[PDB]
Write a protein that binds this ligand. Structure first.
Ligand SMILES: *[B@@]1([O])O[C][C]([C][O])O1
Length: 261
């Protein structure tokens, strides 16, 4: 199809490996490019950790207000929000927001701890029907993005379906789903990625990811004005360990998808 030829050309021009999955919820049609190949999730995995904590809060009603101490030893490589609260506390809600909207790695590690380890995050994925997602490591080593390594990967198809279920479906309770949507819509790290290839009038909620091998990812829910929402996952990785990020590729892939609608 036209869109798949344009995505292939974009990939060829980029020098890397591009994975795309689009779900149009109007007719549940899907557009896939390398949709069943594994890609390193990097920080896109933070959505799953936050959603797992939200699921816990359906039974533990006060869980998100639980204070969690941030100690100096907790700080890792990228902690824009946690750094502001060293030797103090953040609630689980604040940690979830930080992980999602600022991609805070300390916050992610606290979420993982709350879930009983990476296996607890993976288990949540399995519980909502995602057989592909696997989280194996904590921050920052889950971002190594080594070619061929299946750790800390998923496929575009799987992540699109899971993101749909979490945000537009009913994998979470009503208050929890709404909270997740609010968090994603307030992301601060996404301006140069999917959002940049879409009409400025569309509302987007997204989570970016970055890692070694120039890995540059973004997963989004998109609410076009007067039109069913769309779920779009764009994963990109490159052959050189020290390659630069290529957010423009994700913007271009989004633009190509948007043109075909
Ligand atoms: B994710 O991918 O977003 C930023 C941080 C950097 O380690 O991880």
């Amino acid at each position: 199809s036209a869109v798949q030829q344009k995505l292939a050309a974009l990939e060829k021009s980029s020098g890397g490996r591009l994975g795309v999955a689009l779900i149009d919820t109007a007719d549940n049609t899907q557009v896939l490019y390398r949709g069943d190949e594994r890609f390193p999730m990097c920080s896109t995995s933070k959505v799953m950790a936050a959603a797992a904590v939200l699921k816990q809060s359906e039974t533990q009603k006060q869980l998100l207000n639980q204070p969690v101490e941030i100690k100096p030893a907790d700080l890792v490589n990228y902690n824009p929000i946690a750094e502001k609260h060293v030797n103090g506390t953040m609630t689980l809600a604040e940690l979830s927001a930080a992980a999602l909207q600022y991609s805070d790695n300390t916050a992610m590690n606290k979420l993982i701890a709350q879930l009983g380890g990476p296996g607890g995050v993976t288990a949540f994925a399995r519980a909502i029907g995602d057989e592909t997602f696997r989280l194996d490591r904590t921050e920052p080593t889950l971002n190594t993005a080594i070619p061929g390594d299946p750790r800390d990967t998923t496929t575009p198809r799987a992540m699109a379906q899971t993101l749909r279920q979490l945000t537009l479906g009913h994998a979470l309770g009503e208050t929890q789903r709404a909270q997740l949507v609010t968090w994603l819509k307030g992301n601060t790290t996404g301006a140069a990625s999917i959002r940049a290839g879409l009409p400025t009038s569309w509302t987007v909620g997204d989570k970016t990811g970055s890692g070694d091998y120039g890995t540059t990812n973004d997963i989004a829910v998109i609410w076009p004005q007067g039109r069913a929402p769309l779920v779009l996952v764009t994963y990109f990785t490159q052959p050189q360990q020290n390659a630069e990020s290529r957010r423009d590729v994700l913007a271009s892939a989004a633009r190509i998808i948007a043109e075909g609608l």
